[PDB]
């Protein structure tokens, strides 16, 4: 009878969905937090059965989406939403979509929960290389993908039982440089990986709650493609060609690792970057003239 | 029908036993590899009912020990056994206890296995500190504690299914210095951790097998008490006071992590050091100032 | 005949000054970038000879401060300065103090330069632990101490010869948690250490310019004290008691390491975190019951 | 009046020679430690004028070689020398070439020294890959390439002044996997790097001596060509194409870094791996996509 809130699904091709899927296997109940620029479209599609293929696990196995909620990790409380957004065509009529508000909403409909998933990032100047990134873009990049965590945490902590567990998805570009992962994104993942440690410290001592981050390998998500055959087709090709594990990398591969961190089985792991990436990170050089 | 071989275990108060309990939850067959010198005394205790309590997994299921074999990580093959130990009282009443010998044995009787555990260390001069450690002592430590993993992998690979998984147990003394943990042990784990990556690539690319290592926090095992109010009673004292996670670290804590890494659920993780240490590894200074 | 611009001196008790000092030894000419809330006071004191003690190197050795400039790393170009600051009592009448403007000023008075020093940080909610840090505070923390680098870089790159070198000062709290280094500061140093890599990449390939960061140990600076005998007296005590090198840690110790990175001698080092900290970072545990 | 002993050098095309040139710039006396087997052929070349060109530091100063001694990193003391090598043609015409023997020698003739360099490696089975590497081979690699540093430190510490400095040369194959670099070499450097920390603490606390290691990028030395268009011609090719720093890495590049770490100028750096590799270590994937 565990409940998990997933911040950041827009379709079935992301890591969000992968996570959601494997969490169903373990019979855990799933709440989607959905960015308002996509909420209505995700909703409609779902009613249309556009996802019925993708909700299939195996033997009789569907999914169990408890609830689907509008949610914007930019806004901490309702006093944050600026007037222009408060009025936006997309945001206009949706309510309780800040971080503080969803916590309450969830706690009202379902009480305390014990699993929190951060699978989101956003950065305006991503296509600009770091050196040519504006201040206003960089701080945006960090607001939307680093802080959204810290803040998710402050607020969700009170609707969580002790022994609850939290995860987030990071990228190796934080540790080693991969060019064209810019406009703040590499800084943001770097900070997110440090905050994972510090938060683990406070949440551990104070609430008996754990937090970790998964350094994911390359997956063909909506957002991955949005990064301008692109950077992510190369990323995949390279990985499928050079990683120690040569199999294709599925979102469920991260999904099953996520479920594990989230469950009691990993109670002795906290503050860690766990790479789930067919082991690419362990490589230094292409092994070209070594494969002869 | 999964079989796991565990190399290194002389009692129930160690990590290997933590690992075996937790795998038995997943109905995994366990073969034990026991250091010849304690092999007979372990057999006797087993036979005398000393482990029946420790063998209970829960309400009407116990531990499924498929077999228990003498195994010595010092000797790769038959040729490697030296006169003094052919002589040696504890060794003479036993046979086929070299790495290549237990590999053929297991395989002769039960076929291919698919989970392998290296949970052993020896450092004749642990008592001394690195600077006062001798060449003979140091290398004995590297031989038994680091190379034994490579030799295990080489001889056991043939008898394992593709998509199999191997683990080792390491310690933070390799990354950050821990005074008292001497005689080569740090160097040994330092090498175990890197070999984990290198092997992760060879196994990864050639046999589609995965290999990871578990950085465990402190446990009051017999090996740990033999370092010596013992450089383990401090370790435990400090950890329970300072680690993000106030809980007391149990062997099964590592076992559950082992079980997972050894399963299909983690098919995309290879070559990693996975810290299962209540998060102690993330801390810099004691937090005495902060706690006020 | 090398010139260096030091962003971030307010007195003689910081790392800025340490760096400035050792750079004089190697006869390099020094330009101070000084935060306007302190500019006038630093100026007056200097004219008064309040620093004449502290400008002494050794035999006949004074310093050679080329020029002392107002400078605020918050503002990239003059179009950034908001009206309230444009009007502030402290900022009112000072000109050309944004990042873009000082670059020009310097290039006009002295042409191209070849050494850039980032020794600054600022964070509003430093006294708040991370979990209880506002978004607006965090993004501030990162703006002032992470981005100020990236932006210093964009702009200063064009007033720099190829083979010029750049450094910044970081703290170990980015890698391992030290509580009460909050309100964004640990995230900010974490990002700064990642940006050091990425910038090294671009500046290396494009301009033949190097960038590194120095993970400094604890020094009793103005700002260190401002962090609420405080956290930094403990930090020092602990370090002087537990670091492998038991000597007291001087700003000139970082200063001499800085000068080296900045000089040609280190032409093969870039993108690195170099710890200058009497080796504290290498420790895992206090060695209390080991010193018996 | 500073004396530096360099352990491991058979010609001018290596790193040790890079180190000696650059220290001679600082008027540091150089004692060479040469592997007995090449000691005589090196002596002859020296005598025959083959190094006169390489010995020029600049306009009217050459290299000050105080002495040149046979030195074998395999043997700590007299007792350690085995019959076959007492016999051995190359070895028999020589004496006092064990670690403890060259320590007493140097000290007998010239007193206390204050800079020590370990610039040597051997891996009998480098050609094989870790999985196919034998126990005898692996340990020989750890013995000659890793433990020889500890033994050097122990026997040389007495004959060194407080505030002295020791360096070792390492390689990234220990952190991230490099296929081809086999037979134990990775494990060896993996251990050299951790020992550097542990020794950094013992030396640090007890004798006020410092110890660091230099992670060098590739150089076409005789040792490197003997790995084998050679797993060094790739290394160099790749590095000059991909490393942030387009320059061609010279031995003196490392030498200047060595000189510095070995000086007082770095009194606050101990226990560190310092990458002197044109920054190649910071990169993740080749940047082919980006460069377009
Ligand atoms: N796919 C990869 O190659 C890859 C690799 C490593 C890490 N990641 C990480 O995985 C996570 C998910 O990305 P993905 O690759 O699955 O693509 P994705 O497009 O599925 O994920 C982005 C999701 O976050 C949501 N989102 C964006 N901005 C938001 C905001 N302000 N508030 C609330 N929600 C918002 C979007 O609706 C979208 O569904 C990110 O943390 C990303 O950095 C992805
Ligand atoms: N206990 C801890 O606090 C702790 C912490 C971190 C890592 N570890 C690691 O966990 C692993 C398991 O050890 P443990 O601490 O549970 O102690 P343990 O006594 O349970 O296991 C050590 C075993 O090594 C075996 N052994 C020693 N030399 C051998 C040889 N030459 N051939 C064959 N077997 C040999 C013995 O069977 C012994 O039981 C070790 O690698 C240890 O380094 C332990
Ligand atoms: N002292 C330590 O214990 C320690 C340890 C590790 C790292 N550091 C780092 O060293 C650097 C210098 O700090 P310090 O400890 O020498 O103290 P400091 O007070 O000397 O340094 C701060 C300086 O930066 C200037 N500054 C602040 N905000 C600015 C802004 N917006 N624009 C321009 N200048 C600004 C201030 O005038 C001040 O002189 C920082 O990067 C800090 O994170 C300090
Ligand atoms: N060349 C590179 O690309 C490179 C890169 C990274 C690290 N390194 C490291 O730099 C160091 C110097 O080696 P190099 O690459 O300049 O090659 P090198 O041939 O100059 O030095 C290796 C030396 O090791 C000595 N040696 C070998 N076995 C010995 C023994 N048993 N006793 C005494 N001496 C012995 C020989 O004198 C030999 O000259 C090595 O540790 C190497 O691993 C080299
Ligand atoms: O908004 N962005 O710029 C952006 C950038 C990157 C994003 O995720 C990744 C997509 C692909 C990869 Cl390889 C790593 C990632 O972190 C996401 Cl979800 C969003
Ligand atoms: O041979 N030893 O000395 C030795 C030393 C330590 C051993 O295990 C550990 C026990 C305690 C800790 Cl903290 C770390 C360990 O690696 C083991 Cl199994 C064996
Ligand atoms: O503005 N702050 O909050 C702030 C916080 C920390 C600052 O520097 C440090 C001072 C002391 C230490 Cl230990 C590490 C540091 O990074 C500085 Cl200069 C400024
Ligand atoms: O004994 N070996 O095989 C061996 C192998 C490599 C050696 O040096 C290196 C040469 C090249 C590189 Cl890339 C790294 C190195 O460590 C040395 Cl000095 C010796």
HEC assignment per residue over C65-94: EEEEEECCCCCCCCCCCCHHHHCCCCCCCC
Query: Which ligand number lies closest to the CA of residue B149?
Result: 2
The reply to whether residue B245 touches residue A270, judged by beta carbons under 8 angstroms, is: yes
Q: List the catalytic residue out of C181, C207, C229, C234.
A: C181
Instruction: Kindly tell me the sign of the dihedral angle through the C-alpha atoms of A229, A231, A234, A235.
Output: negative
Q: Is B67 on the interface with D (CB under 8 A)?
A: no
Instruction: For chain B, give the residues followed by a break (C–N over 2.5 Å).
Output: 228
Mention every residue, 6+ apart, whose C-beta is less than 8 A from residue B90: B36, B37, B39, B40
The reply to whether residue B231 touches residue C287, judged by beta carbons under 8 angstroms, is: no
Q: Looking at chain D, how many residues does it have?
A: 292
Compute the distance from residue D221 Cα to the ligand 8 centre, in Å.
9
Mention every residue, 6+ apart, whose C-beta is less than 8 A from residue D237: none
Interatomic CA distance for residues C51 and C42, integer angstroms: 9
Compute the distance from residue D108 Cα to the ligand 4 centre, in Å.
27
Q: List the catalytic residue out of A15, A138, A147, A181.
A: A181
Select the residue of D134, D198, D271 nearest B130 (Cβ to Cβ).
D198
The reply to whether residue D289 touches residue A231, judged by beta carbons under 8 angstroms, is: yes
Beta strands A113-118 and A160-170 are parallel
Interatomic CA distance for residues C20 and C4, integer angstroms: 9
Interatomic CA distance for residues B117 and B18, integer angstroms: 12
Q: Is D176 on the interface with B (CB under 8 A)?
A: yes
| φ, ψ at C62 (rounded to 5°) | -90, -165
How many C-beta neighbours within 10 Å does residue A290 have?
15
* Residue of D81, D129, D131 for testing the chain B interface, max B β-carbons within 10 Å: D131
Interatomic CA distance for residues C181 and B54, integer angstroms: 45
Interatomic CA distance for residues B193 and A182, integer angstroms: 32
Interatomic CA distance for residues B271 and B256, integer angstroms: 19
Interatomic CA distance for residues B191 and D191, integer angstroms: 5
User: Chain A closest CA to D119's CA: distance in Å?
Assistant: 23
Chain C residue numbers touching D268 (CB-CB < 8 A)? 217, 245, 247, 249, 253-254, 257, 276-278
User: Chain B closest CA to D149's CA: distance in Å?
Assistant: 10
Query: Which ligand number lies closest to the CA of residue A217?
Result: 1
CB contacts < 8 A (A, C): 116
Interatomic CA distance for residues A218 and C272, integer angstroms: 26
Ligand 8 contact, D223 CB (< 6 A): yes
Contact A20, A63 (CB under 8 A): yes
Chain A residue numbers touching B278 (CB-CB < 8 A)? 204, 268, 270
Select the residue of D142, D188, D201 nearest B177 (Cβ to Cβ).
D201
User: Which chains have 3 or more CB–CB distances shorter than 8 Å to chain D?
Assistant: A, B, C
CB contacts < 8 A (C, D): 127
Chain A residue numbers touching D127 (CB-CB < 8 A)? none
User: Chain A closest CA to B119's CA: distance in Å?
Assistant: 18
The reply to whether residue B245 touches residue A277, judged by beta carbons under 8 angstroms, is: no
Mention every residue, 6+ apart, whose C-beta is less than 8 A from residue B73: B7, B8, B35, B99, B120, B122, B144, B148, B151, B152
Q: Is D138 a catalytic residue?
A: no
In angstroms, the first-to-last Cα distance of chain B is 54
The reply to whether residue A131 touches residue C199, judged by beta carbons under 8 angstroms, is: yes
Mention every residue, 6+ apart, whose C-beta is less than 8 A from residue A125: A133, A134, A137, A138, A140, A141, A182, A183, A184
> Which residue, among C285, C57, C235, C244, has the nearest Cα to D268 in the 3D structure?
C244
Ligand 8 contact, D227 CB (< 6 A): yes
Q: Which residues of B are catalytic?
A: 171, 181
Chain B residue numbers touching A210 (CB-CB < 8 A)? 245
Q: Could you tell me the CA-to-CA distances from A40 to A10, A43, A70, A83 in Å, in that order?
A: 10, 5, 9, 21
| φ, ψ at D164 (rounded to 5°) | -70, 175
How many C-beta neighbours within 10 Å does residue A66 have?
17
**Whose Cα sits closest to atom 36 in ligand 2?**
B8
Beta strands in B28-159 (DSSP E): 28-34, 56-58, 61-62, 65-70, 113-118
Max alpha carbon distance in chain A (Å)? 63
| CA B104 centroid distance within chain | 21
Q: Could you tell me the CA-to-CA distances from A130 to A138, A139, C138, C195 in Å, in that order?
A: 8, 12, 19, 8
> Which residue, among D131, A17, D273, has the nearest Cα to B203 in the 3D structure?
D131
Instruction: For chain C, give the residues followed by a break (C–N over 2.5 Å).
Output: 228
Interatomic CA distance for residues C104 and C88, integer angstroms: 23
The reply to whether residue A177 touches residue D238, judged by beta carbons under 8 angstroms, is: no
Beta strands C3-7 and C113-118 are parallel
The reply to whether residue C268 touches residue D245, judged by beta carbons under 8 angstroms, is: yes
Half-sphere exposure (Cβ direction) of D132: Cα atoms closer than 13 Å: 11
Interatomic CA distance for residues B20 and B6, integer angstroms: 8
| Helix ranges (DSSP H) in chain C | 15-25, 39-48, 83-86, 99-110, 135-142, 148-156, 185-207, 222-226, 231-242, 251-262
Q: Looking at chain C, how many residues does it have?
A: 292
Contact D178, D125 (CB under 8 A): no
Compute the distance from residue B196 Cα to the ligand 6 centre, in Å.
18
Angle between helices A148-156 and A99-110 (to 10 degrees): 40
Q: Could you tell me the CA-to-CA distances from D112 to C85, D2, D212 in Å, in that order?
A: 61, 9, 20
DSSP 8-state assignment for residue A177:
B
Ligand 7 contact, C192 CB (< 6 A): no
Q: C-alpha angle with apex C174: B274 to B247, nearest 5 degrees?
A: 45
Q: Is D181 a catalytic residue?
A: yes
Q: Is C15 on the interface with D (CB under 8 A)?
A: no
Q: Could you tell me the CA-to-CA distances from B91 to B41, B44, B83, B147, B148 in Å, in that order?
A: 13, 16, 11, 22, 19
| φ, ψ at C276 (rounded to 5°) | -125, 90
B152 in helix, strand or coil?
Answer: helix
How many C-beta neighbours within 10 Å does residue B226 have?
11
Half-sphere exposure (Cβ direction) of D163: Cα atoms closer than 13 Å: 7
Ligand 3 contact, C181 CB (< 6 A): no
Reported resolution, Å: 3.0
Elucidated via: X-ray
Domain C1-292 in CATH: superfamily? NAD(P)-binding Rossmann-like Domain (3.40.50.720)
User: Chain C closest CA to D115's CA: distance in Å?
Assistant: 17
Ligand 4 contact, D213 CB (< 6 A): no
Select the residue of B153, B174, B188 nearest D131 (Cβ to Cβ).
B153
Element (H, E) at A5: strand A3-7
Q: Is B129 on the interface with D (CB under 8 A)?
A: yes
Quick one: chain D helix, strand, coil %, rounded to 5? 45, 20, 35
Alpha-carbon dihedral B31, B33, B36, B40, rounded to 10 degrees: -30
D74 in helix, strand or coil?
Answer: coil
Ligand 3 contact, C218 CB (< 6 A): yes
Query: Which ligand number lies closest to the CA of residue B120?
Result: 2
| CA B261 centroid distance within chain | 14
Select the residue of A238, A287, A290 nearest D285 (Cβ to Cβ).
A238
Atom of ligand 8 at shortest range from CA of D169:
16
Q: Could you tell me the CA-to-CA distances from B280 to A192, A203, A205, B171, C231 in Å, in that order?
A: 19, 14, 12, 12, 21
């Amino acid at each position: 009878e565990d409940i998990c809130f997933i911040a950041g699904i827009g379709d079935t091709n992301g890591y969000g969905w992968g996570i959601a899927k494997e969490l169903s296997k373990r019979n855990v109940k799933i709440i989607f937090g959905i960015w308002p620029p996509v909420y209505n479209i995700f909703m409609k599609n779902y009613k249309n059965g556009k996802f019925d293929n993708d909700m299939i696990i195996d033997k009789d196995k569907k999914m169990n989406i408890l609830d689907m909620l509008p949610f914007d990790a930019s806004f901490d409380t309702a006093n944050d939403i600026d007037e222009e957004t408060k009025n936006n065509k997309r945001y206009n009529m949706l309510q309780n979509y800040t971080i503080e508000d969803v916590a309450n909403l969830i706690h009202q409909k379902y009480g305390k929960i014990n699993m929190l998933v951060h699978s989101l990032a956003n950065a305006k100047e991503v296509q600009k290389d770091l050196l040519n990134t504006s201040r206003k873009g960089y701080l945006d990049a960090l607001s939307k993908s680093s802080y959204s965590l810290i803040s998710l945490c402050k607020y969700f902590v009170n609707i969580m039982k002790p022994q609850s567990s939290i995860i987030s998805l990071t990228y190796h570009a934080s540790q080693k440089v991969v060019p064209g992962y810019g406009g703040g994104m590499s800084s943001a993942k770097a900070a997110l990986e440090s905050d994972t440690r510090v938060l683990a410290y406070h949440l551990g001592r104070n609430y008996n709650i754990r937090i970790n981050t998964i350094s994911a390998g390359p997956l063909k998500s909506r957002a991955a493609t949005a990064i301008n055959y692109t950077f992510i087709d190369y990323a995949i090709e390279y990985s499928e060609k050079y990683a120690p594990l040569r199999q294709k990398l599925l979102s469920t591969d991260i999904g099953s690792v996520a479920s594990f961190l989230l469950s009691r089985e990993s109670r002795a792991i906290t503050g860690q970057t766990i790479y789930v990436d067919n082991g690419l990170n362990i490589m230094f050089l292409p092994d070209d003239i070594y494969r002869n």
